[PDB]
Write a protein that binds this ligand. Structure first.
Ligand SMILES: C[C@H](NCCc1ccc(O)cc1)[C@H](O)c1ccc(O)cc1
Length: 463
């Protein structure tokens, strides 16, 4: 009772459809009102509401806010919220005592709770922006409220821990012995699709893809930020994962189309299908669907002579993989739900589903007279991004082979060419090795001398 004037404290402007919109349904009957949208001011007010705690909103807000508000602006808004002016006196004590107990203290504790969640669950904002951390530490160090003391200490201890974990691998059971074929350790120059063991290609790619996947934060996906001007800052782990997928997909395509000799090309496709089967055995659906993407590419898809020459069992394994992707990944989604982790989900489908949600819902409930942020849109994207988290907790029981890891981290099939110049190259080479005519395929010689014979995908050294 008795708040500062809206003139001196922007939060306490009267709630209206000008500034805040709530769900009006059977769910929003009782409990905390559900926010559909608002001005950033009203979202901040509701994030730090005097009348009740809202942990669900705090969690969703700190996952999604970068799609409507910069980290620097969030910190400025929370400090603005904290600095509450005293109401205009009636004439000439008691009122101030209530205001401090019922309004100021609860709002200030709610802000310090937001700070605690922010540093606990989204410290990457501060790792990315040292000035943001300087502002935060300066502010929290200025807070002198007697009730604030345990909160400031809590925040300070989280920051100490977070900093210490940017300075400072452990098997729960024996991992399998590393498989070798023609290529030998420390002979990274001899490393090739066909000289490495297909088992160990699949294992080392799985460890690499698992590591990339486990580093992607939900906030790298919200607001389609990976396709926008601040993508390198908002989505650095997701961009690494996408660049990995592009490079590995184009590498598979390159290995096939550059195999000018028919027998070598069939052996290369056969070996990629063996790698696909080990990815399947490892629940690396990311790897499975990268090979599916390579085989459906325009330059490989048209190599009917090469596909028709496969062993029927290899063709069967490939057809079943290709089918996982058909009808909006219906069979993929069934398979993903049925498996025991560890697993590497196909990341492409989360991107597609977020792009569809981002393109299909307005960022704003309206920009006429105010920026009214569509929060319900962000709640929907956070439900999708939330699915990514359930498979980031279980590491693989596989030993890293550091030369193979370096080999796969440094795949550059495009060389110094554009992706478009590279894919035009692959298509023109595809037309050369299997022309658009009804004649038997051209007979080119092999340029490589390695045996085409697969060691197969039953562990040998495993023994
Ligand atoms: C069917 C694939 N060739 C299609 C040929 C074509 C070329 C150009 C077009 O515009 C349309 C079709 C391939 O052999 C294959 C791919 C995946 C498999 O699991 C099995 C086979």
């Amino acid at each position: 009772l008795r708040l500062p004037s809206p003139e001196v404290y922007r939060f306490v402007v009267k709630d209206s459809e000008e500034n805040i919109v709530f769900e009006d349904n059977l769910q929003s009957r009782s409990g905390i009102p559900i926010i559909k949208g608002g001005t950033v001011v009203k979202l901040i007010e509701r994030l730090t509401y005097h009348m009740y705690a809202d942990p669900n909103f705090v969690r969703t807000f700190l996952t999604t806010y970068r799609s409507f508000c910069k980290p620097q602006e969030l910190l400025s808004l929370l400090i603005e919220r904290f600095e509450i002016p005293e109401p205009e006196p009636t004439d000439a004590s008691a009122d101030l005592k209530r205001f401090r107990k019922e309004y100021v203290q609860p709002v200030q504790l709610r802000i310090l709770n937001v700070f605690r969640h922010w540093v606990e669950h989204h410290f990457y904002d501060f790792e990315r922006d040292l000035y943001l951390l300087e502002r935060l530490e300066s502010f929290i160090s200025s807070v002198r409220g007697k009730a604030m003391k345990k909160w400031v200490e809590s925040i300070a201890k989280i920051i100490r821990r977070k900093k210490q974990a940017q300075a400072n691998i452990t098997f729960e059971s024996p991992p399998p012995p590393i498989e070798w074929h023609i290529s030998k350790p420390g002979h990274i120059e001899t490393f090739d699709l066909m000289t490495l063991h297909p088992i160990e290609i699949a294992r080392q790619l799985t460890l690499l893809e698992s590591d990339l996947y486990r580093k992607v934060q939900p906030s790298e996906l919200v607001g389609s930020v990976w396709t926008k001007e601040d993508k390198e800052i908002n989505s650095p782990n997701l961009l690494k994962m996408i660049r990995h997928t592009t490079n590995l997909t184009l590498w598979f395509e390159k290995c096939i189309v550059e195999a000018e000799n028919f027998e070598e090309r069939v052996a290369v496709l056969s070996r990629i299908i063996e790698i696909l089967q080990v990815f399947q055995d490892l629940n690396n659906f990311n790897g499975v669907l990268e090979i599916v993407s390579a085989v459906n590419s325009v330059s490989v898809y048209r190599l009917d002579h090469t596909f028709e020459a496969l062993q029927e069992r290899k063709r069967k394994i490939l057809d079943e993989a290709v089918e996982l992707s058909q009808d909006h990944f219906k069979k993929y989604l069934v398979k993903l739900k049925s498996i025991n982790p560890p697993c590497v989900p196909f990341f492409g489908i989360y991107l597609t589903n977020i792009l569809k949600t981002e393109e299909g819902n307005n960022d704003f409930l309206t920009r006429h007279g105010k920026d009214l942020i569509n929060f319900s849109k962000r709640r929907k994207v956070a439900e999708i991004t939330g699915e990514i988290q359930q498979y980031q907790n279980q590491p693989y029981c596989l030993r890293i082979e550091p030369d193979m890891r370096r080999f796969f981290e440094n795949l550059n099939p495009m060389g110094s060419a554009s992706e478009k110049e590279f894919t035009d190259y692959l298509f023109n080479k595809s037309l050369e090795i299997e022309p658009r005519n009804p004649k038997q395929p051209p007979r080119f010689p092999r340029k490589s001398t390695f045996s085409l014979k697969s060691p197969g995908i039953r562990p040998n050294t495993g023994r």
